[PDB]
Scaffold this active site. Structure first.
Site, PDB file in Angstrom:
ATOM      1  N   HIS A  10       0.817  -1.071   0.006  1.00  0.00           N
ATOM      2  CA  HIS A  10       0.043   0.107   0.043  1.00  0.00           C
ATOM      3  C   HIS A  10       0.894   1.126   0.011  1.00  0.00           C
ATOM      4  O   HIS A  10       2.132   1.020   0.504  1.00  0.00           O
ATOM      5  CB  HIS A  10      -0.919   0.071   1.206  1.00  0.00           C
ATOM      6  CG  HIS A  10      -1.886  -0.978   1.422  1.00  0.00           C
ATOM      7  ND1 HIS A  10      -1.847  -1.857   2.364  1.00  0.00           N
ATOM      8  CD2 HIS A  10      -3.221  -0.923   1.077  1.00  0.00           C
ATOM      9  CE1 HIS A  10      -3.121  -2.657   2.205  1.00  0.00           C
ATOM     10  NE2 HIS A  10      -3.886  -2.041   1.607  1.00  0.00           N
ATOM     11  N   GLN A  43     -25.151  29.008  10.823  1.00  0.00           N
ATOM     12  CA  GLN A  43     -25.227  30.451  10.262  1.00  0.00           C
ATOM     13  C   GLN A  43     -26.337  31.520  10.592  1.00  0.00           C
ATOM     14  O   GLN A  43     -25.942  32.692  11.031  1.00  0.00           O
ATOM     15  CB  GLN A  43     -25.245  30.079   8.700  1.00  0.00           C
ATOM     16  CG  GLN A  43     -23.818  30.194   8.234  1.00  0.00           C
ATOM     17  CD  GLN A  43     -22.931  31.206   8.810  1.00  0.00           C
ATOM     18  OE1 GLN A  43     -22.028  30.511   9.505  1.00  0.00           O
ATOM     19  NE2 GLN A  43     -23.200  32.242   8.761  1.00  0.00           N
ATOM     20  N   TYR A  50     -21.521  24.041  12.126  1.00  0.00           N
ATOM     21  CA  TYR A  50     -21.142  25.372  11.844  1.00  0.00           C
ATOM     22  C   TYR A  50     -22.057  26.115  10.780  1.00  0.00           C
ATOM     23  O   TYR A  50     -22.673  27.044  10.758  1.00  0.00           O
ATOM     24  CB  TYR A  50     -19.881  25.573  11.445  1.00  0.00           C
ATOM     25  CG  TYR A  50     -19.521  26.779  10.879  1.00  0.00           C
ATOM     26  CD1 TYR A  50     -19.434  27.069   9.355  1.00  0.00           C
ATOM     27  CD2 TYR A  50     -19.156  27.903  11.628  1.00  0.00           C
ATOM     28  CE1 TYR A  50     -19.212  28.324   8.796  1.00  0.00           C
ATOM     29  CE2 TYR A  50     -18.739  29.301  11.041  1.00  0.00           C
ATOM     30  CZ  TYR A  50     -18.785  29.329   9.603  1.00  0.00           C
ATOM     31  OH  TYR A  50     -18.640  30.649   9.008  1.00  0.00           O
ATOM     32  N   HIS A  60       0.321   5.264   0.917  1.00  0.00           N
ATOM     33  CA  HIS A  60      -0.538   6.191   1.776  1.00  0.00           C
ATOM     34  C   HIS A  60       0.056   7.617   1.185  1.00  0.00           C
ATOM     35  O   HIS A  60       1.116   7.697   1.440  1.00  0.00           O
ATOM     36  CB  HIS A  60      -0.435   6.114   3.066  1.00  0.00           C
ATOM     37  CG  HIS A  60      -1.342   4.474   3.369  1.00  0.00           C
ATOM     38  ND1 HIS A  60      -2.482   4.633   4.049  1.00  0.00           N
ATOM     39  CD2 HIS A  60      -0.758   3.420   3.624  1.00  0.00           C
ATOM     40  CE1 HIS A  60      -3.028   3.529   4.112  1.00  0.00           C
ATOM     41  NE2 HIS A  60      -1.725   2.642   4.018  1.00  0.00           N
TER      42      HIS A  60
END
Lengths: 151, 129
Positions: A60, A127, A123, A62
């Site tokens: 693998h 608003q 968040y 990454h």
DNA sequence: AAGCCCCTAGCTTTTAGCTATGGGG
DNA sequence: AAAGCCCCTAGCTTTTAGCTATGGGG
């Protein structure tokens, strides 16, 4: 969180990308592993991609990359796989004669930000309901900076 | 987080997208606000984009969307701004006469994942064991 | 929610080898 | 400021429009 910009966009796009050699063959070792990372750094450098972190293991690779959204993460991946395959297969005879291709047709991609999903989610929903912070201290710096940058 | 896949890729690509109307004009209200949202849902569905959250204030629209990396975040954005601009200006006279365009040429884009950056960066460097 | 097999044009890595919200098995 | 203001080309959608492009200029 550091934000960049191109001629039209302000952004911060980070991706954790992972892909394996064909058949999961454990060939990402020694000189192969080393060359592979050098080629990918070369690729990133010319595609203006910032490699934040990059490690491998037998089967693998990454990569945590910051990529201009308009350029496209796939354009980067396609180039890194394609070029490393062509080059490594030329340098390491076993990768050419014992495999039909160095990589597979797939990959794994996950986006990453400065705060977890649930925080950004809240968040956004906050608003219009005035100043309603995420929590007491949890991610104050992120939310504050965000309000400012997305003003 | 639940990953999705197209024919060749497994992914989870979420973005916090924000853009404002031209001149920061506070026009995203009432009837306009509601229609903009419908149009964005209409475009999302059509473009196979999952809208996780969408909120608006007078002069900003925030969208948290999951978008196929092979398809492209930008392709979703231009369609969403472009169509919404066309439709809203056809339906709302004051948007067509008071402004040369509804939006601007810019937008804000921020990737988000189930885990913060530092965590993912650690997990990655720990891949030798 | 890919990974195996096969296929295409497009584009780079071009006597290659990978993507495309690609086709099918 | 530049992301946001101005102006332009070029490509594709929304196309008797209006937004993109690791676009370029100011």
């Amino acid at each position: 969180v550091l934000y960049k910009s191109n001629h039209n966009v302000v952004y911060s796009c980070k991706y954790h990308i992972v892909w394996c050699p064909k058949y999961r063959r454990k060939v990402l070792v020694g000189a192969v592993e080393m060359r592979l990372k050098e080629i990918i750094q070369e690729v990133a450098k010319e595609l203006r991609v910032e490699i934040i972190e990059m490690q491998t293991d037998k089967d693998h690779i990454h990569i945590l990359a910051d990529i201009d959204p308009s350029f496209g993460v796939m354009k980067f991946i396609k180039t890194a796989k394609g070029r490393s395959s062509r080059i490594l297969r030329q340098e390491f005879n076993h990768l050419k004669t014992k495999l039909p291709t160095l990589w597979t047709n797939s990959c794994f991609i996950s986006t990453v930000g400065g705060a977890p999903l649930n925080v950004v989610k809240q968040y956004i929903e906050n608003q219009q309901n005035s100043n309603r912070p995420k929590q007491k201290e949890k991610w104050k710096s992120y939310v504050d900076n965000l309000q400012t940058k997305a003003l």
